[PDB]
Design a protein around this ligand. Structure first.
Ligand code: NAG
Ligand code: NAG
Ligand code: NAG
Ligand code: NAG
Ligand code: CL
Ligand code: MG
Lengths: 389, 389
């Protein structure tokens, strides 16, 4: 009955939707571990080291339960909240912390190989020792957390590359992989992957708010959208392109990095609307739902250009409650029920929407779509990854 | 007198002693700026984004006054505390923030050239925009601070390479260079450097504590160690090797990275201790003062090996008053007055002591010395950098 605990964290600059992906990366690994030993994944509390990223509202120590449905995840891999780890093991005590990093020697191409090795630390360590020789660190904002040991792993391939190593030194009841973004997916478009991805189902509350918005302002219900919905995700398998979707255009415009990132892969507002109108005409769509990070000045400019834009603006208390990821989820959930969707180039946000649309069963031609930069020369659309059951 | 303002910050992992080096790099940029426009450098508050790195108990927004002598600093370049800047500009408002970064394309060997260019941001920018369109950021832990605009600058050479660009766009009353560590020194061994370096003189109360420790436990005073002291640091010049030093051996052992960094350039505790006793024999020194980061188990073992070791262990309340860099500065100060000194390989802490010793005038043969790895073959010693008065 004595099992082992896996914990992870991601490089602080990474956003909500990248973290959702790394999660599947880590789940791949844990499944590989479970073939041998008893393990359980501990869900890293939400909220970010950089507190200024989410203005005026503190997003901190947020359980997954506020975003995703725990039973839904559990049907895939054994999973527990960090606050629960803290209760089962005596305190917030982590035996081994492994900071993932690349190989310093690099490689000359043709050498590249999936491998993992204990190595000296490349960047100086962000953990440090107290008067008790415990390692103090970020630890998802739980200040009282202590690692017993920290060191670095140089690593290359898919996440499961690390399992032999973790399965060897069994001394560690709890192991944490920091900088888990270093791990790749085992196999991304694959059945194992989809089992996981499908199993992350939004919390009932965010779905309900999103659904009611769909019916009030989008004239969109699951019935009218020919999206038969099922509760247990294991039991929901839908034929491709059967789903119709609400009579509206979903769009995701990402302005955040447009300027300082010197981007040629994102449109001007004026360009974005030209495309949008072309889509509305093509598909006979009266209303467009826009999910955007745009600032007020730029939003007004968009609002004037495209009056029929409908948008979900959380009230102050809604934001205080659902938090940031929460709102993002509603926006995603709504875009995902659109008749047709157009996203932003290489946006992780748009990526999650795709997967979500593929799950609901919407035709790919309506799914993998992106705005072209105004003068962008040859603009390639995102790649369609079909589900495998 | 409407003068421009310069502010900077350094990559968060960076410790206290690398920061003090960067300061001089910046200060050399300011000197080059003063050849044209009226400027003043704003002293970035001490205290760290990653708070768990410091034993300082969330002690933050610390002015340079608690470490360095402000008049002393001001005789080198014009300088003000950050809170003073908030008062003299209108609010906590920085006009332009430049995040310093390396050139995206790297270089081919032989192509390396000092250059600065506005470029697309490589890493995702840590600053983020609010609903008033202002950028919020870490900003030395002052939540109120607002930047008006943010972009990344790719840069290569010495810190003064940024000066011409900074003088072209004059619309910016205040300018902040984030990731300042990307700038090199102008010329490190030279007069200009040494003017800045000599000008950084520890706050009176800190030296007063060290002299107290010296007088008491080390049987050491300036008049006994033949180290005449001079308040006006411009008026302090000593013949090289005129300084004797106290009847003790100063040693700096940094153990922090010994293990996780797989270090071969630092000794095991025994290798350290044997080397110490041999030095005390050779140089006829009665007592030994050790400045180290060793945590309990190690210190315990170090204490058995070297019982005659005297150390600076501040009281709970002392650590509060002087804070972290204070305890460090005291330790450094004490080391700097030893008759003979031996440090740790590539330790910024050691470098800072090196520099302080050259300033007191102690013979180089007694300054630039490091412990060798137990099995380290080459084992180069640190390079003598003379003051040029
Ligand atoms: C941490 O790891 C090292 C290397 O395996 C080990 O020798 C040491 O005992 C560990 N530290 C603690 C506090 O258990
Ligand atoms: C809304 O969509 C439904 C499809 O079920 C359609 O029958 C109806 O005409 C639409 N109503 C409006 C307000 O356009
Ligand atoms: C700020 O700098 C960017 C360069 O990244 C520039 O394009 C933008 O127009 C500037 N904003 C203002 C308000 O001057
Ligand atoms: C202290 O230093 C003096 C040199 O001024 C030396 O002569 C003396 O023997 C030392 N010892 C003690 C205990 O005073
Ligand atoms: Cl969030
Ligand atoms: Mg011995």
């Amino acid at each position: 009955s004595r099992r082992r605990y896996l914990l992870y964290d991601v490089n602080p600059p990474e956003g909500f939707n990248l973290r959702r992906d790394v999660y599947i990366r880590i789940a791949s690994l844990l499944k590989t571990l479970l073939k041998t030993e008893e393990w359980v994944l501990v869900l890293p509390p939400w909220g970010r080291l950089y507190h200024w990223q989410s203005p005026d509202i503190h997003q901190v120590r947020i359980p997954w339960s506020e975003f995703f449905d725990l039973p839904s995840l559990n049907k895939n891999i054994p999973v527990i909240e960090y606050e629960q780890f803290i209760a089962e093991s005596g305190g917030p005590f982590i035996d081994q912390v492994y900071v993932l990093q690349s190989y310093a020697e690099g490689w000359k191409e043709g050498t590249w190989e999936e491998k993992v090795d204990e190595r000296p630390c490349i960047d100086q360590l962000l953990y440090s020792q107290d008067k008790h020789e415990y390692y103090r660190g970020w630890f998802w904002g739980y200040e009282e957390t202590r690692g017993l040991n920290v060191s670095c792993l140089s690593v290359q391939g898919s996440a499961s590359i690390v399992a032999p190593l973790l399965l060897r030194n069994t001394s560690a009841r709890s192991v944490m992989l920091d900088r888990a973004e270093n791990l790749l997916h085992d196999h991304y478009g694959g059945k194992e992957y989809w089992d996981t991805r499908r199993s992350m189902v939004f919390a009932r509350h965010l779905r309900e708010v999103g659904d009611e918005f769909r019916s009030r302002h989008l004239n969109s219900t699951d019935d009218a959208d020919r999206i038969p919905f099922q509760e247990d995700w294991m039991k929901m398998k839908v034929k491709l392109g059967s789903a119709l979707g609400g009579p509206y255009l979903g769009v995701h415009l990402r302005r955040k990095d447009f300027i300082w990132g010197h981007r040629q892969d994102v449109p001007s507002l004026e360009g974005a609307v030209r495309k949008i109108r072309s889509l509305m005409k093509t598909h006979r769509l009266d209303k467009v739902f826009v999910a955007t990070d745009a600032v007020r000045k730029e939003y007004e400019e968009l609002k004037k250009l495209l009056p029929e834009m409908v948008r979900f603006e959380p009230t102050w208390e809604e934001l205080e409650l659902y938090k940031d990821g929460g709102v993002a989820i509603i926006d995603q959930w709504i875009c995902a029920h659109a008749r047709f969707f157009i996203g932003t180039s290489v946006s992780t946000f748009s990526f999650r929407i795709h997967e979500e649309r593929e799950i609901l069963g919407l035709d790919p031609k309506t799914t993998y779509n992106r705005f072209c930069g105004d003068q962008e020369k040859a603009c390639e659309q995102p790649t369609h990854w079909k589900i495998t059951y």
